[PDB]
Amino acid sequence: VPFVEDWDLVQTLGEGAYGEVQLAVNRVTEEAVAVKIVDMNIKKEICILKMLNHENVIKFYGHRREGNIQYLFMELASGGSLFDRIEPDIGMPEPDAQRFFHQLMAGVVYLHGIGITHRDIKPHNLLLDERDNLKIADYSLATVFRYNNRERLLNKMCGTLPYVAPELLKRREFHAEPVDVWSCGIVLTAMLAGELPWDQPSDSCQEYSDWKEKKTYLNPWKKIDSAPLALLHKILVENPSARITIPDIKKDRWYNKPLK
Ligand SMILES: CN(C)c1ncnc2nc[nH]c12
Ligand SMILES: [Cl-]
């Protein structure tokens, strides 16, 4: 079994483009963490990771260079991902979706508050701890959109097409926060319907045209109760300046509904 200083690398949790993530167990003390292995953009990632301190964001423990391998030591989420809690074509019980959505908003308010955009919110990047607490993971696409209290517009296109906001396909430059809000709306759809609404929010996508024409008698919308669906009407708004902000999501009727 491979090892790093005091830790044993004992199994693969994830295989992504950006290296492997391993379960690491201190042989002495028995503490289990996760270790991202990069065979060396990473200067920046580690800088953002060291900023992160919130119960709904993956904590960064530190890194070691060992030749051309960088090791990034991070909080372990032993509950797997939100992706594995979503039943295809069904989703999950509304009260569980609501709790995960509450946690996802707490995490995203946190990141936006330290001027960080995640840029790839999707169920594979939302991990669960042993108590099913949600942790926003993977800061490999994350970037600074606010510094010294001044906003910078983004112009890099990145993310995952079914989760990306339409302005990202159409505008030369756009605001960071409404793109992350949109991807949370697609995550909420996936949790309540167990299906993604469209391949991408482009005019050439029939499913996206159908939503803009308010055909909510179609899937996935017909599986979603009127209350969460009215919130999805405010989140999945094509014009990012008309799109609901997180302060106004927090005042939404479904957001505040007591559930099982
Ligand atoms: C799958 N994967 C990337 C991970 N699994 C468990 N805990 C983690 N902490 C950071 N990434 C983790
Ligand atoms: Cl899905």
From Swiss-Prot:
Catalytic activity: L-seryl-[protein] + ATP = O-phospho-L-seryl-[protein] + ADP + H(+); L-threonyl-[protein] + ATP = O-phospho-L-threonyl-[protein] + ADP + H(+)
Subcellular location: Nucleus; Chromosome; Cytoplasm; Cytoplasm, Cytoskeleton, Microtubule organizing center, Centrosome
Membrane spanning stretches: none
GO biological process, alphabetically ordered: apoptotic process; apoptotic process involved in development; cellular response to mechanical stimulus; chromatin remodeling; DNA damage checkpoint signaling; DNA damage response; DNA repair; DNA replication
Superkingdom: Eukaryota
DNA damage recorded as keyword: yes
EC nos: 2.7.11.1
A cellular component annotation (GO) from this entry: centrosome
Residues annotated to bind ATP: L13, G14, E15, G16, A17, Y18, G19, E20, V21, K36
Purpose of the protein: Serine/threonine-protein kinase which is required for checkpoint-mediated cell cycle arrest and activation of DNA repair in response to the presence of DNA damage or unreplicated DNA. May also negatively regulate cell cycle progression during unperturbed cell cycles. This regulation is achieved by a number of mechanisms that together help to preserve the integrity of the genome. Recognizes the substrate consensus sequence [R-X-X-S/T]. Binds to and phosphorylates CDC25A, CDC25B and CDC25C.
Protein name per its UniProtKB record: Serine/threonine-protein kinase Chk1
Organism field: Homo sapiens
